[PDB]
Design a protein around this ligand. Structure first.
Ligand SMILES: CC(C)c1c(-c2cnn(CCNC(=O)CCl)c2)[nH]c2c(C#N)cnn2c1=O
Ligand SMILES: [Mn+2]
Ligand SMILES: [Mn+2]
Ligand SMILES: [Zn+2]
Length: 456
């Protein structure tokens, strides 16, 4: 038996409220960050086109077994068209229930999902699509291409809710990152079938995410507020300890399906929703979420980072260091990139970046004093941003270095961050070298330029 979590908040903004997505998200944040996820129904005449030929859209399916607490990975031959995938998917669901696909109630599919995942006798496997846009299978929103668009497609080209606009919109600081981090910054396309499932996870760097269901049967979500993130992790550590073995790569972290009733039993707040076609789901920083598809559908989702998020992004990279997990990008490098563009930044952005930069500079001053007292005397400026990420990771904690690192002539090519000076080599301290991107004297005017831009 299954007891459905309480429903998450649903917002129905008017057009005035809906027009600017970042202003609207900021307004709902007090309510929505208490539930981790929320649903947004756009005003009734915001309806972007869905004009695809299912016979020309191709993608490589992925296979999924459905066993509660079984380890699965994040995704990185075979081929379906959207038509043949849809036909396989609909026949699977109608054969599974011996009913037409739409008369299966969502409550029932939900019940049956949690039954089949917990029964070891059942060996159900399903297939799904998950990838970024490609020439073989593009975004569900209109994009610019030199094909003629209808005036209705043109209406939605520059919408803030056209998710293709997210990796380039001013108020997502992720847009400032020059590094090509395609897996994180670009929209993902999700082609679902009944019971295809996304395991419990938070987004990289604790970013927000936003998900739009273009068409098809609904997507069922479970969400946990960011404040209960460690509570949830402790519950999963106890019940599925195999998922917490230290992982060699970011593409090797383990995730799993877990009944939300199990989390509720252990006092973790969980909320649910059925996302229907034309609706958005927003996940907030560090809000765990999982779910499954009710049947054949097509969704598009993207990460983003508001100024709200900057302190949490710093807190996240700290937490990655404690865990020895790889970063997707350097947070400090992104801060300094924005500082170098201060004259062009939005004034509220400049004020918030400035506050994060002050913490960064004080933390960095203290760390350099600590390593100097360990006998590291030699030093040389180094343009960390020119190194491929895997050439500038701390040997100990895997963090991506940018502000500074320690090298040692006895272990050429290796780096540690300033927390792990004692982990690099066994040579005497005068053979170590501090490699730094900026002097403290470079840094204070960078921050000052942000204060000027903000105070205007
Ligand atoms: C079932 C698919 C189409 C799907 C996925 C998804 C990605 N990867 N896998 C395989 C299992 N691994 C993990 O879930 C890694 Cl954490 C599923 N993610 C998501 C999200 C999210 N956020 C929302 N809708 N949505 C989907 O409908
Ligand atoms: Mn099973
Ligand atoms: Mn997600
Ligand atoms: Zn380190």
């Amino acid at each position: 038996m299954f007891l459905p979590p309480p429903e998450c908040p649903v917002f129905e903004p008017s057009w005035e409220e809906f027009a600017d997505p970042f202003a609207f998200i900021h307004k709902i944040r007090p309510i929505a960050e208490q539930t981790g996820i929320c649903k947004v129904r756009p005003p009734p005449d915001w309806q972007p086109p869905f004009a695809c030929d299912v016979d020309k859209l191709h993608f490589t399916p992925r296979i999924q077994r459905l066993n509660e607490l079984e380890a699965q990975t994040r995704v990185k031959a075979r081929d379906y068209t959207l038509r043949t995938f849809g036909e396989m998917a609909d026949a699977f669901k109608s054969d599974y229930f011996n009913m037409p696909v739409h008369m299966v109630p969502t409550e029932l599919v939900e019940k049956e999902f949690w039954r089949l995942v917990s029964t070891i006798e059942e060996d159900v496997t399903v297939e799904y699509g998950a990838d970024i846009a490609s020439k073989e299978f593009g975004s569900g929103f209109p994009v610019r291409d030199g094909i003629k668009l209808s005036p209705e497609e043109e209406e939605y080209l520059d919408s803030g809710w056209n998710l293709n606009n997210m990796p380039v919109m001013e108020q997502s600081v992720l847009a400032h990152i020059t590094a090509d981090i395609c897996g994180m910054k670009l929209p993902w396309l999700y082609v679902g079938m009944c019971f295809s499932s996304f395991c419990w996870h938070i987004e990289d760097h604790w970013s927000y995410s936003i998900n739009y269901l273009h068409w098809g049967e609904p997507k069922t979500w479970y969400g946990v507020p960011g404040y209960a993130a460690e509570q949830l992790e402790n519950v999963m550590k106890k019940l599925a300890p195999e998922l917490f073995v230290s992982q060699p790569d970011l593409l090797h972290q383990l995730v799993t399906i877990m009944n939300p009733n199990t989390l509720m039993t252990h006092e973790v707040p969980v909320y649910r929703t059925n996302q229907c076609a034309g609706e958005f789901v927003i996940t907030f920083p560090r809000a765990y979420h999982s779910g499954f598809n009710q049947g054949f559908n097509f969704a598009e989702a993207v990460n983003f980072c508001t100024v709200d998020w900057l302190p949490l992004g710093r807190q996240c990279v700290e937490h990655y260091r404690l865990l020895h997990r790889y970063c997707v990008f350097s947070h400090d490098e992104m801060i300094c990139k924005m500082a170098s563009k201060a004259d062009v930044l939005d004034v509220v952005v400049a004020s918030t970046v400035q506050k994060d930069m002050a913490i960064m500079i004080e933390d960095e001053k203290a760390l350099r004093e600590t390593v100097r007292k360990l006998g590291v005397i030699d030093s040389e400026r180094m343009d960390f941003e020119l190194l491929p990420d895997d050439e500038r990771q701390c040997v100990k904690c895997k963090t991506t270095c940018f502000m500074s690192a320690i090298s040692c002539s006895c272990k050429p090519g290796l780096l540690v961050c300033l927390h792990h000076v004692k982990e690099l080599c066994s040579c005497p301290p005068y053979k170590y070298k501090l490699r730094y991107r900026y002097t403290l004297d470079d840094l204070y005017p960078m921050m000052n330029a942000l204060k000027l831009r903000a105070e205007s």
